[PDB]
Design a protein around this ligand. Structure first.
Ligand SMILES: *[C@@H]1O[C@H](CO)[C@@H](O[C@@H]2O[C@H](CO)[C@@H](O)[C@H](O)[C@H]2NC(C)=O)[C@H](O)[C@H]1NC(C)=O
Ligand SMILES: *[C@@H]1O[C@H](CO)[C@@H](O[C@@H]2O[C@H](CO)[C@@H](O)[C@H](O)[C@H]2NC(C)=O)[C@H](O)[C@H]1NC(C)=O
Ligand SMILES: *[C@@H]1O[C@H](CO)[C@@H](O[C@@H]2O[C@H](CO)[C@@H](O)[C@H](O)[C@H]2NC(C)=O)[C@H](O)[C@H]1NC(C)=O
Ligand SMILES: *[C@@H]1O[C@H](CO)[C@@H](O[C@@H]2O[C@H](CO)[C@@H](O)[C@H](O)[C@H]2NC(C)=O)[C@H](O)[C@H]1NC(C)=O
Ligand SMILES: *[C@@H]1O[C@H](CO)[C@@H](O[C@@H]2O[C@H](CO)[C@@H](O)[C@H](O)[C@H]2NC(C)=O)[C@H](O)[C@H]1NC(C)=O
Ligand SMILES: *[C@@H]1O[C@H](CO)[C@@H](O[C@@H]2O[C@H](CO)[C@@H](O)[C@H](O)[C@H]2NC(C)=O)[C@H](O)[C@H]1NC(C)=O
Ligand SMILES: *[C@@H]1O[C@H](CO)[C@@H](O[C@@H]2O[C@H](CO)[C@@H](O)[C@H](O)[C@H]2NC(C)=O)[C@H](O)[C@H]1NC(C)=O
Ligand SMILES: *[C@@H]1O[C@H](CO)[C@@H](O[C@@H]2O[C@H](CO)[C@@H](O)[C@H](O)[C@H]2NC(C)=O)[C@H](O)[C@H]1NC(C)=O
Ligand SMILES: *[C@@H]1O[C@H](CO)[C@@H](O[C@@H]2O[C@H](CO)[C@@H](O)[C@H](O)[C@H]2NC(C)=O)[C@H](O)[C@H]1NC(C)=O
Ligand SMILES: *[C@@H]1O[C@H](CO)[C@@H](O)[C@H](O)[C@H]1NC(C)=O
Ligand SMILES: *[C@@H]1O[C@H](CO)[C@@H](O)[C@H](O)[C@H]1NC(C)=O
Ligand SMILES: *[C@@H]1O[C@H](CO)[C@@H](O)[C@H](O)[C@H]1NC(C)=O
Ligand SMILES: *[C@@H]1O[C@H](CO)[C@@H](O)[C@H](O)[C@H]1NC(C)=O
Lengths: 162, 55, 198, 149, 81, 280, 50
């Protein structure tokens, strides 16, 4: 457009221009609407979709198949399963809830048993039988041993200049 | 006679459409609360621009 | 520990991070940085000073920038390691040389003692804890009215198996008959809620 | 995709987890070009056809606007001596659109045409016609010996 | 008049006061831009077959605020206080 | 995308600077990974999911101002609703991207899971005392638990049993006062706003440094590439990479430095949750 | 406290580190950095803008 070069999708804009502007924009010089020099009409501009990809795999040792997550993109222009963190390809949807190993995001995570994706389960549910005239006392006991590891130091390295 | 020009003399600096934004600009403006001179065919100076009101 | 692996992930992660950072630093020495060659020996043995100095300046500034970045990352990592070491020393001081009354600090349960063991670049704590089990639930009462006087337990709790009343400690179940050597009296019982005749 | 993952990790074995390999952008096609609505020829020719020029202490100026300016027709001419064109480039001048053009004309001896350039001193460049420090469109000097000799 | 270009702005609004300039804010929409190139140092009004206030502009930095529809609602003069 | 906006020659030229991009991506990825462990260590301390019974015989205390309400958008309580309304949204659908190359990822734990964790912790604390941290839950009447808790500071247990109504009324009045204070004043939550302000301002500073000449002839790459020939345009392509690289490096360093303190605060909050809610 | 020296070490190291950092910052103003001269006024007063 008259020396203005760019890429995107042109749509019929709704914002109203005063009769003396040539092109609109927004914060930090992002050209948002332009009038064409022939039909005088106003069209708004926005870039088409783009974004990263991720691969979910159970490990080469176990299986040789993967699933692909396209981040932050509507899978209408890329079983396809629509998440809130993008959209997933190669993983079926199950309506059961388990504890999962590979997190994806927005409460959705996938695992291997193939390559199913579900909503992570918070934990086992139970209701304590509360009452105002009863208590519960243990009768037996157990002795348990637990381990924990803490780092304290790393290697000492020196690098010269010359 | 002299008069105070409270908030008069603000124009559109450029031919760009903006909305819902605060924009900091630097240009030739009439200072706020400036001192305008009432007049009543005298030749007048034209320093770097003239704001010419009327009634 | 002998069978299952990947139980020492923290130390392995630290070593991996350090080695990866060092390898990335040493890998930057082969970059052109806009000069004509990546090695000083060929540049010096192929040109005269007037523009050889420009080439050397480019290479020097690139290498210096890489070195500065590496040093900054090392400083951040060292600060994190210092924080972890301080936490480990605190845990040793409270849990090995004494007994900890602060919950969930050492183990999951009631702490008894701990044993330290060495590690390639860290320390391993073994905590011994006491955990109750085999629960059973009875009927309780807050106080007992005898001859118009309210009796409360010194230490323990009132329980009933269905016909008789006993005083038992909180964390274990051993019943004792109610005498005047384990209960104390406090006034009359007309405002207490839950009194029982016995 | 597993091959891409192995490339990213630079190893033949990958463990359990999620990895980030690359990114994808939609490829655009069918380019469009929109230009203004006038096709008048431009008087660029008259400036070089000017029979008379001026002296350096009073140099002639013309403002050019509302044209369809063609520079390939002037560039391909082999009658010019020096055409060192600063600013942008000669060959791409046909792909740009400007707002105004300033044409400046005079005549000077052959030993001073090297001095029409920013960032330098002398007599004529400092006391007759000084170019600014940013740039000029560009300077065109051509031989004309019969006209004033 | 800036670097060979002569610019004229304008506005027209009704007021209720009869003494001096009223209190309020309204932006000025450009009308005429001319590529003349000559300079001006003095000027003089002309009559037909009243009063007029004259003020002088100075270089300054302002902070303008735009509304939803793209019309300036208010401004702040940075070098005042 | 940030340094060489959707171009080809600039990407080729950037390859000569070695590998000054795996470091930035790896640092950002590490920060993003630890930002989930920070939340996981705090709330995820309960094993099961307890729930309060329909019985509401707590001796006089009313917890209805903090217990979850089923007729709520996210099954939150009154205090949580006020806190949400007193803190200043792209969560409707997938709309998180930018032309510059910056994106915001969604958190692993949605707010409903956090609310469920808090409700489970509160219900366990109310209905089982401190016994649900060591092993399994042991039900015990609330009045008896409070009488046990007075005994831990020196005061004997006959003080509560004879002054129960006064204590219950005082607790209810204190809860009401806290409700009124939170509803009226909104400047109490000053610690949670500083982080948001700092992050937003740093991101704005990063974005606002793309329209800078840095010594070149233009601040946009396309016009330089569409006006200069390519045996000379490479001189002006440089002096633009060397500034956009320094800006990114500064942003990454500042992000690491200010994420360390967030990690420290998360550790402190985890400790407080461990030895002040579960025990005494 | 009043007899043995080097008892309040940590504060002394903090002060020394701050002083050394400030000194080495103010000391870098005299470096050439690959230019003709480290003084800006003279190098402006001896050459043309280009
Ligand atoms: C994917 O794209 C479709 C097409 O635009 C979206 O459908 C519309 O989405 C907007 C908001 O993004 C809504 O306001 C409209 O009501 C939707 N219309 C229809 C017919 O669905 C869709 O929401 C996008 N996202 C997904 C996950 O499909
Ligand atoms: C404790 O008393 C109750 C009385 O039934 C029992 O525990 C509850 O049992 C009901 C089933 O009727 C469950 O719905 C509740 O969830 C239980 N409460 C718990 C587990 O806290 C049980 O009979 C008694 N406990 C023992 C060990 O006998
Ligand atoms: C729980 O407390 C109540 C009183 O606070 C105890 O007894 C109540 O007695 C009245 C008659 O005075 C009845 O109308 C109520 O129905 C009883 N309460 C309940 C919950 O039924 C009661 O014994 C206490 N213990 C239990 C296990 O309910
Ligand atoms: C509650 O405990 C008491 C005391 O242990 C029980 O009373 C004893 O019951 C046994 C049952 O065989 C008798 O042999 C004893 O003689 C009883 N003792 C006395 C002093 O009478 C009582 O039976 C227990 N109640 C229940 C329901 O188990
Ligand atoms: C505990 O014993 C006392 C005294 O025997 C009971 O108090 C009496 O209750 C009866 C019946 O309600 C009244 O007529 C008397 O006036 C009360 N006082 C006295 C001195 O007899 C009390 O009700 C008993 N408690 C229980 C739970 O049975
Ligand atoms: C003066 O103008 C005429 C016509 O505009 C130019 O004549 C053209 O010259 C070119 C170059 O030799 C030829 O290819 C065209 O065929 C000529 N056209 C005509 C109509 O004669 C002439 O070059 C101009 N002179 C100068 C000095 O610019
Ligand atoms: C911005 O523009 C809109 C639309 O032009 C204005 O809304 C109009 O307001 C007038 C007066 O109140 C109504 O008669 C019209 O019906 C409205 N149109 C629409 C489409 O709503 C609005 O007043 C302008 N100003 C602001 C601050 O929004
Ligand atoms: C706990 O006490 C509070 C304080 O009064 C109660 O809140 C009010 O309860 C009354 C009685 O039903 C209602 O009419 C009011 O509308 C409640 N206040 C509000 C702001 O809703 C609360 O209901 C009590 N809870 C229980 C379980 O008794
Ligand atoms: C101890 O202090 C409490 C409150 O701090 C007193 O309770 C108040 O007493 C006054 C006077 O009788 C009542 O008007 C209030 O309604 C009471 N407050 C509540 C919450 O009920 C209490 O009286 C004091 N103790 C003594 C022995 O005076
Ligand atoms: C452009 O020119 C064409 C042909 O002269 C005409 O049909 C069209 O209306 C013009 N566009 C304008 C004036 O915006
Ligand atoms: C590969 O998987 C098998 C079974 O899943 C396991 O026994 C083996 O240890 C694994 N190999 C490695 C190197 O972990
Ligand atoms: C999920 O699967 C179960 C299987 O029985 C089905 O009943 C349920 O309707 C499914 N949910 C949805 C949203 O389709
Ligand atoms: C304007 O100028 C006149 C004369 O110089 C002076 O008396 C008057 O106070 C001035 N008014 C203001 C607002 O400066």
């Amino acid at each position: 457009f008259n020396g203005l070069t760019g890429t995107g999708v042109l749509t019929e804009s709704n914002k109203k221009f005063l009769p003396f502007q040539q092109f609109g924009r927004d914060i930090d010089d992002t050209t948002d609407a332009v009038r064409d020099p022939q039909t005088l009409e106003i069209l708004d501009i926005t870039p088409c979709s783009f974004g990263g990809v991720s691969v979910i795999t159970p490990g080469t040792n176990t299986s040789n198949q993967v699933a692909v997550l396209y981040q932050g993109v509507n899978c209408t222009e890329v079983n396809v399963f629509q998440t809130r963190a993008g959209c997933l390809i190669g993983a079926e949807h199950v309506n059961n809830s388990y504890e999962c190993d590979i997190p994806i995001g927005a409460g959705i995570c996938a695992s291997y048993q193939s390559i199913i994706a579900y909503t992570m389960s918070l934990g086992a549910e139970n209701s304590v039988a509360y009452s105002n005239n009863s208590i519960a006392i243990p009768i037996n006991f157990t002795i348990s041993v637990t381990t924990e590891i803490l780092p304290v130091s790393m290697t000492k390295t020196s690098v010269d200049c010359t | 006679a002299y008069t105070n020009s409270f908030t008069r003399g603000v124009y559109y600096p450029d031919k760009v459409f903006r909305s819902s934004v605060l924009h900091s600009t630097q240009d030739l403006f009439l200072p706020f609360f400036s001192n305008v001179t009432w007049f009543h065919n005298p030749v007048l100076p034209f320093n770097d621009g003239v704001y010419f009101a009327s009634t | 520990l002998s069978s299952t692996a990947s139980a020492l992930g923290k130390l392995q992660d630290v070593v991996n991070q350090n080695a990866q950072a060092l390898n990335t630093l040493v890998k930057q020495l082969s970059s052109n940085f806009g000069a004509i060659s990546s090695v000083l020996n060929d540049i010096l043995a192929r040109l005269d000073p007037p523009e050889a100095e420009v080439q050397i300046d480019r290479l020097i500034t690139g290498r210096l920038q890489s070195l500065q970045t590496y040093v900054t990352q090392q400083l951040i990592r060292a600060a994190e390691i210092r924080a972890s070491a301080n936490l480990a020393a605190t845990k040793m001081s409270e849990c090995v040389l004494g007994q900890s009354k602060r919950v969930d600090f050492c183990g999951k349960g009631y702490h008894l003692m701990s044993f330290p063991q060495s590690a390639p670049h860290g320390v391993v704590f073994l905590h011994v804890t006491y955990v109750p089990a085999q629960e059973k639930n009875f009927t309780t009462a807050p106080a007992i009215c005898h001859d118009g006087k309210a009796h409360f337990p010194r230490e323990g709790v009132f329980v009933s198996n269905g016909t008789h009343w006993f005083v038992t400690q909180r964390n274990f179940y051993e019943p004792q008959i109610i005498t005047t050597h384990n209960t104390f009296v406090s006034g009359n019982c007309d405002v207490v809620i839950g009194i029982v005749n016995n | 995709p597993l091959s891409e993952t192995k490339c990213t990790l630079k190893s033949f074995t990958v463990e359990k987890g999620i990895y980030q390999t690359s990114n994808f952008r939609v490829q655009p096609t069918e380019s469009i070009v929109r230009f203004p609505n006038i096709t008048n020829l431009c008087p660029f020719g008259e400036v070089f056809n000017a029979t008379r020029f001026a002296s350096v202490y009073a140099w002639n100026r013309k403002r050019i606007s509302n044209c369809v300016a063609d520079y390939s027709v002037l560039y391909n001419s082999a009658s010019f001596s020096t055409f060192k064109c600063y600013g942008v480039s000669p060959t791409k001048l046909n792909d740009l659109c400007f707002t105004n053009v300033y044409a400046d004309s005079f005549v000077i001896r052959g030993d001073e045409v090297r001095q029409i350039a920013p960032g330098q001193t002398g007599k004529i460049a400092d006391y007759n016609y000084k170019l600014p420090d940013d740039f000029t469109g560009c300077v065109i000097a051509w031989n004309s010996n019969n006209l004033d000799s | 008049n800036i670097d060979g270009y002569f610019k004229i702005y304008s506005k027209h609004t009704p007021i209720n006061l009869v003494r001096d300039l009223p209190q309020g804010f309204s932006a000025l929409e450009p009308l005429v831009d001319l590529p003349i190139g000559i300079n001006i140092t003095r000027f003089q009004t002309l009559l037909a077959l009243a009063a007029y206030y004259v003020g002088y502009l100075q270089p300054r930095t302002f902070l303008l605020k735009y509304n939803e529809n793209g019309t300036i609602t208010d401004a702040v003069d940075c070098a005042l206080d | 995308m940030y340094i060489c906006g959707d171009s080809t020659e600039c990407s080729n030229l950037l390859l000569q600077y070695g590998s000054f991009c795996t470091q930035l991506n790896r640092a950002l990825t590490g920060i993003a990974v630890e930002q989930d462990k920070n939340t996981q260590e705090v709330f995820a301390q309960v094993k099961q999911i307890y729930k309060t019974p329909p019985i509401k015989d707590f001796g006089g205390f009313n917890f209805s101002q903090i217990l979850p309400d089923p007729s709520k958008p996210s099954k939150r309580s009154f205090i949580e609703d006020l806190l949400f309304n007193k803190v200043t949204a792209a969560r409707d659908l997938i709309c998180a991207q930018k032309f510059n190359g910056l994106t915001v990822l969604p958190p692993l734990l949605t707010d409903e899971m956090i609310a469920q964790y808090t409700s489970a912790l509160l219900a366990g604390t109310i209905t089982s005392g401190w016994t649900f941290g060591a092993g399994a839950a042991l039900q015990i009447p609330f009045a008896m638990q409070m009488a046990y808790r007075f005994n831990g500071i020196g005061v004997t247990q006959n003080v509560l049993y004879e002054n129960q109504k006064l204590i219950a009324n005082q607790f209810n009045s204190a809860i009401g006062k806290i409700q009124d204070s939170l509803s009226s004043t909104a400047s109490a939550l000053g610690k949670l706003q500083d982080v948001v302000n700092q992050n937003a301002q740093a991101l704005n500073t990063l974005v606002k440094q793309l329209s800078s000449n840095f010594g070149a002839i233009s601040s946009v790459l396309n016009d330089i590439l569409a006006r200069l020939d390519p045996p000379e345009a490479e001189v002006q392509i440089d002096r633009l990479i060397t500034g956009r690289l320094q800006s990114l490096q500064t942003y990454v360093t500042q992000q690491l430095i200010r994420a360390a303190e967030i990690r420290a605060s998360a550790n402190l909050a985890a400790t407080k949750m461990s030895e002040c809610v579960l025990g005494q």
